Design a binder for this molecule. Structure first.
Ligand SMILES: CC[C@H]1OC(=O)[C@@](C)(F)C(=O)[C@H](C)[C@@H](O[C@@H]2O[C@H](C)C[C@H](N(C)C)[C@H]2O)[C@](C)(OC)C[C@@H](C)C(=O)[C@H](C)[C@H]2N(CCCCn3cc(-c4cccc(N)c4)nn3)C(=O)O[C@]12C
Ligand SMILES: [K+]
Ligand SMILES: [K+]
Ligand SMILES: [Mg+2]
Ligand SMILES: [Mg+2]
Ligand SMILES: [Mg+2]
Ligand SMILES: [Mg+2]
Ligand SMILES: [Mg+2]
Ligand SMILES: [Mg+2]
Ligand SMILES: [Mg+2]
Ligand SMILES: [Mg+2]
Ligand SMILES: [Mg+2]
Ligand SMILES: [Mg+2]
Ligand SMILES: [Mg+2]
Ligand SMILES: [Mg+2]
Ligand SMILES: [Mg+2]
Ligand SMILES: [Mg+2]
Ligand SMILES: [Mg+2]
Ligand SMILES: [Mg+2]
Ligand SMILES: [Mg+2]
Ligand SMILES: [Mg+2]
Ligand SMILES: [Mg+2]
Ligand SMILES: [Mg+2]
Ligand SMILES: [Mg+2]
Ligand SMILES: [Mg+2]
Ligand SMILES: [Mg+2]
Ligand SMILES: [Mg+2]
Ligand SMILES: [Mg+2]
Ligand SMILES: [Mg+2]
Ligand SMILES: [Mg+2]
Ligand SMILES: [Mg+2]
Ligand SMILES: [Mg+2]
Ligand SMILES: [Mg+2]
Ligand SMILES: [Mg+2]
Ligand SMILES: [Mg+2]
Ligand SMILES: [Mg+2]
Ligand SMILES: [Mg+2]
Ligand SMILES: [Zn+2]
Lengths: 112, 120, 44, 215, 122
RNA sequence: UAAGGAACUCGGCAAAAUGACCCCGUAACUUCGGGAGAAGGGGUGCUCUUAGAGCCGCAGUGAA
RNA sequence: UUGGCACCUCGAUGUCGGCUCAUCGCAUCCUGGGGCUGUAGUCGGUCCCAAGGGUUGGGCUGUUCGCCCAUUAAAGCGGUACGCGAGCUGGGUUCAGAACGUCGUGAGACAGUUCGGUCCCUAUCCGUCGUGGGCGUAGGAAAUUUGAGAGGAGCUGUCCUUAGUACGAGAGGACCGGGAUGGACAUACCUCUGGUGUACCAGUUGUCGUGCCAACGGCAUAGCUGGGUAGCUAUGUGUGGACGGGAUAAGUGCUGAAAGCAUCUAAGCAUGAAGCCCCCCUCAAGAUGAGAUUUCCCAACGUUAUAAGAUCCCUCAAAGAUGAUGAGGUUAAUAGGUUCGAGGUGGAAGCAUGGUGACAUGUGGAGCUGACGAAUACUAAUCGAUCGAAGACUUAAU
């Protein structure tokens, strides 16, 4: 009954900080396409965590030039070099979908 | 889970009524599908009664009906009190399986399978 | 929507070939006449 | 050239060398044994017969398929093996390279092998034309009284009949399906597991047959 | 997921403000376009003084979608809006400036000038 | 109900949207009554003090 | 097609267009093969073979038709009651109202127009799609199978390279090969992204209850709102069809006479299409021609009881309208319960503390948790009953 876990255990990462929805993360994402491999930081608030094991994902949202952007990552993807927990948010639900229609001050998340 | 030919609210109410009736009378005759559904309800209630804490009692109060039971001699108690009193003590050392279903056969009016479900 | 021709006696009985009931699944009561299998006596 | 029997456990994902996401199907292929060699001389064609999952030994008054009956017990005992739940033939193998009674481990397949996976698709029950044959609905408004019906089933006086093969409601699913050119992602000797790229037919716990791709 | 009659904001300074998708290019029966695809569209709203006038039928490349795209590593990017950039025949933008972030996928389509002009590529 | 938003269809048919109360604001035209609820905006929960100060939620005519 | 004829139907053969669903022809729109060219190349023109597959989304109009916008490899022409209303619609057309123009003294009418205007039917037979029971298949049975035969599939774009080469003043720009990658379509599947998720978690309004507080229950679309497991799912994730062999079409030949020559043909010998038969997928021995392999079982006197093997009955789900199929039936994990997990929700109650209070913090990633996983006989799969062979004959090899 634990075959899936047994064969996907080697895929899991152990260098991952603890975080919950509402936290502000700095995600250091590897970019390999082009002529060189480099690192682009994506900073935003975690609006979603879902799944379990190797299939777990999380979603981060930021505003770039006034346009909302969301990146969803597999939690254990090798493409992520590291994650910093920059801020800890005070929120009341697991999914922060209500942020999607909020802008500016109304979209602010109180820190802990 | 079975729908029992009823809407969700009606089914929930019927299951509460059947569970309280079973707790009170300790042995009831119903149809096969209703009994197979209510065994789970009644046994989870008995689990709460064995737990015994205040939160368990209130969770049990979410499901039980407000019925009164006249005991041996003009002394009253509620179905919730019986569930957390005599019934819970009866099954302290039994790990699940507090009910049993005995089939009786079809009944005249509609050919439905009548069964007895009783506390063990 | 409606039968074009009436159904003969032969065709009707052919169709009723499978229209029947079966003997109940019944067992002798070792101590308590006969009973349905996996049912209690409920009268003995 | 190769074949093995297994049960579908479920779907998961692994990360490739380049960090690419590879959805995979976990197939558990323990306990495979060659039960019989069929040859051109005796049977008219060459194949090996492979039993997959061990059953309980025969007992009197057995009521279910969990226990081998006497014919099955004798057939398996002829190969010095326990009776098996599933038995299938592989005509794509080399009959010479197998001995009756030998095991068929997962290690017969290697990472990067291209395989064909055969299984029985999930059942759907009685289904209408819209779901079973991908047909279009009629209008949902504008006075329509035609939503999920199959539509016209023929022409007229010519031909005064419905042609064979007209697509109609009926039982859907539960058919044998072969998915070609899947790949072996990983073979794990412990747990006797083969990781297959992509999805394969059937419900969880269903039997699947894995063969080296014919194409 | 852009189809016929989908309206998209324009993310350049060509003079078009909003366009309406007339056609998704790329083969018969194609219904949907996404980031990096080329569409035919008409200008519904335009800024006065701009090069591209209301009513013109033009070609645009999609640079932002709400549906977003899935990348090979199992990661996704989605945007809060659908936006496109009006392009010439040789894939160069008709305007001089690009507004808003654009997806990395435009590199694969060789929309390199649009990529260079964008404030952010994600 | 994703994305789209009349591409449906003879026709937006049907559905969706609007909707109560209080306060701003309101065009052409006009028989000077009207048009007009034009349009378009804002507010609303709970606690305390005498209009402010707070408290909670995604959301306060929180349903109809 | 417009007609001509008036042979079936006036004790009724529903008319146009669209929708749904197709099916057939080839006089071929695309794609494949080829001859001629006033064929340099890139493109074309014309003719021959070829029906395998493919062959579009809008504006206007009831429209068919047609014009237009934007695509596409292409947007072929036809038959099937101008295919399809006991499958749908009902905009148009042969209905009662009304109006205009016009005609008529008039009632009224129309090489006309305009607004409005009931689409009934529980499928008996054949036909079709699925799914069972009987018997047969020279003993009975369990499983694995061959494949006579049948169905399915069959499309194609762009880019790179060859090569800026051949061709060509130039402009321009290849055939043949090599590689990459899409559109449409089909199919499987739920890891992912999402949808749903009426016995999952939470917030919240009105009102009535559980005597009151607190905590809860009922009703209001599941009262409403934010999320959401399994399952089922597409817009999501995989996979498939550009192959190879054989025989051919139009063609192209070689050898070669009749007919000293010439000649693809008359005898022979080749070569040559997305087309044919196979190669790929599925079904398939009621294939009454009823096939094959392995294993199991073996009775006496039509009867009675049996063997292998099954069923009845019962617990069920991966299966399912019901049958059927599959997992199990105590020598037992089949379901329920119980205990522990995954996932979901997001911080229970009670109590303490702070605050006038609304509330906040702590105890504490808490409490709760359908369908998912494991363990555990606590509950239910009791007892029992029913069906079920004994292998015919004739001739040949041994
Ligand atoms: C909806 C029910 C009616 O069906 C229809 O109206 C239709 C849709 F079924 C219909 O029109 C059929 C199809 C007609 O037949 C066609 O006649 C054409 C001339 C020729 C055609 N073919 C041969 C080419 C025939 O098929 C005709 C004549 O009905 C008028 C059939 C005859 C036998 C006929 O009169 C029958 C008896 C007709 N009728 C008069 C209705 C008369 C109209 N009506 C009355 C009512 C009503 C009355 C009382 C209460 C309520 N609530 C409603 N509703 N509608 C009824 O009372 O019932 C039905 C069956
Ligand atoms: K209430
Ligand atoms: K608490
Ligand atoms: Mg989670
Ligand atoms: Mg039910
Ligand atoms: Mg209700
Ligand atoms: Mg449609
Ligand atoms: Mg309807
Ligand atoms: Mg929607
Ligand atoms: Mg939406
Ligand atoms: Mg809109
Ligand atoms: Mg339209
Ligand atoms: Mg249309
Ligand atoms: Mg309406
Ligand atoms: Mg109101
Ligand atoms: Mg407010
Ligand atoms: Mg004629
Ligand atoms: Mg005559
Ligand atoms: Mg007539
Ligand atoms: Mg008649
Ligand atoms: Mg021809
Ligand atoms: Mg063809
Ligand atoms: Mg065509
Ligand atoms: Mg017709
Ligand atoms: Mg009609
Ligand atoms: Mg008809
Ligand atoms: Mg009409
Ligand atoms: Mg006159
Ligand atoms: Mg009208
Ligand atoms: Mg065959
Ligand atoms: Mg036949
Ligand atoms: Mg191609
Ligand atoms: Mg899942
Ligand atoms: Mg999901
Ligand atoms: Mg209270
Ligand atoms: Mg009441
Ligand atoms: Mg046979
Ligand atoms: Zn009895």
């Amino acid at each position: 009954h634990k075959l899936i876990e047994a064969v996907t255990k080697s895929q899991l990462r152990t260098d991952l900080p603890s975080f919950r929805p509402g936290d502000t993360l700095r995600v250091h994402v590897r970019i390999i396409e082009g002529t060189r491999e480099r690192i682009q930081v994506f900073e935003g608030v975690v609006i979603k965590r879902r799944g379990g094991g190797v299939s777990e994902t999380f979603t981060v949202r930021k505003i770039s030039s006034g346009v909302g952007v969301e990146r969803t990552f597999p939690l254990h993807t090798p493409k992520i070099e590291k994650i910093e927990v920059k801020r800890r948010g005070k929120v009341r639900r697991a999914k922060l979908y209500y942020l999607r229609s909020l802008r500016g001050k109304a979209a602010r998340i109180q820190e802990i | 889970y079975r729908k029992l030919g009823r809407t969700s609210d009606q089914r929930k109410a019927m299951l509460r009524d059947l569970a309280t009736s079973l707790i009170i009378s300790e042995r009831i005759e119903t149809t096969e599908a209703r009994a197979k559904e209510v065994r789970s309800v009644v046994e989870k209630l008995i689990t709460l009664g064995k737990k015994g804490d205040l939160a368990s009692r209130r969770n049990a109060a979410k499901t039980l009906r407000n019925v009164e039971i006249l005991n041996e001699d003009e002394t009253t108690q509620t179905a919730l009190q019986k569930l957390f009193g005599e019934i819970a003590e009866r099954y302290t050392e039994r790990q699940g399986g507090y009910t049993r279903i005995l089939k009786q056969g079809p009944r005249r009016g509609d050919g439905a399978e009548s069964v007895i479900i009783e506390l063990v | 929507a409606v039968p074009k021709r009436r159904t003969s006696k032969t065709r009707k009985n052919k169709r009723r070939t499978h229209f029947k009931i079966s003997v109940p699944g019944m067992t002798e009561c070792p101590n308590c006449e006969y009973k349905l299998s996996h049912r209690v006596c409920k009268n003995c | 050239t190769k074949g093995i029997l297994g049960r579908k456990i479920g779907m998961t994902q692994v990360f490739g060398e380049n960090g690419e996401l590879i959805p995979v199907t976990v197939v558990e292929a323990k306990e495979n044994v060659v039960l019989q060699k069929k040859t051109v001389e005796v049977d008219g064609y060459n194949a090996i017969q492979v039993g997959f999952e061990d059953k309980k030994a025969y007992k009197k008054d057995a009521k279910s398929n969990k226990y081998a009956n006497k014919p099955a017990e004798g057939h398996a005992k002829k190969a010095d093996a326990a009776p098996k739940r599933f038995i299938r033939e592989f005509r794509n193998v080399d009959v010479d390279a197998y001995e009756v009674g030998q095991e068929v481990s997962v290690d017969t397949f290697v990472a990067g092998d291209v395989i064909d996976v055969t299984g029985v698709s999930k059942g759907k029950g009685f289904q209408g034309a819209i779901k079973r044959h991908g047909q279009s609905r009629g209008p949902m408004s504008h006075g329509s009284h035609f939503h999920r019906a199959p539509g016209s089933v023929g022409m007229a006086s010519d031909a005064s009949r419905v042609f064979k093969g007209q697509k109609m409601p009926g039982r859907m699913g539960g058919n044998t399906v072969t998915v070609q050119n899947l790949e072996v992602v990983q073979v794990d000797t412990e747990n006797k597991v083969i990781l297959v790229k992509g999805n394969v037919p059937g419900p969880k716990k269903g039997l699947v047959e894995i063969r080296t791709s014919i194409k | 997921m852009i189809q016929q009659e989908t309206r998209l904001k324009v993310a350049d300074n060509s003079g078009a403000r909003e366009v309406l998708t007339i056609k998704v290019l790329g083969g018969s029966g194609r219904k949907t376009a996404n980031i990096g695809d080329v569409i035919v569209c008409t200008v519904k709203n335009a800024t006065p003084g701009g090069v591209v006038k209301k009513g013109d039928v033009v070609k645009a490349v999609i640079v932002r979608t709400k549906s977003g795209v899935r990348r090979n590593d199992g990661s996704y990017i989605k945007f809060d809006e659908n936006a496109c950039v009006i392009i010439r025949d040789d894939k160069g933008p008709r305007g001089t400036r690009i507004f808003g972030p654009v997806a990395r996928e435009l590199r694969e389509g060789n929309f390199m000038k649009i990529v260079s002009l964008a404030p952010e590529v994600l």
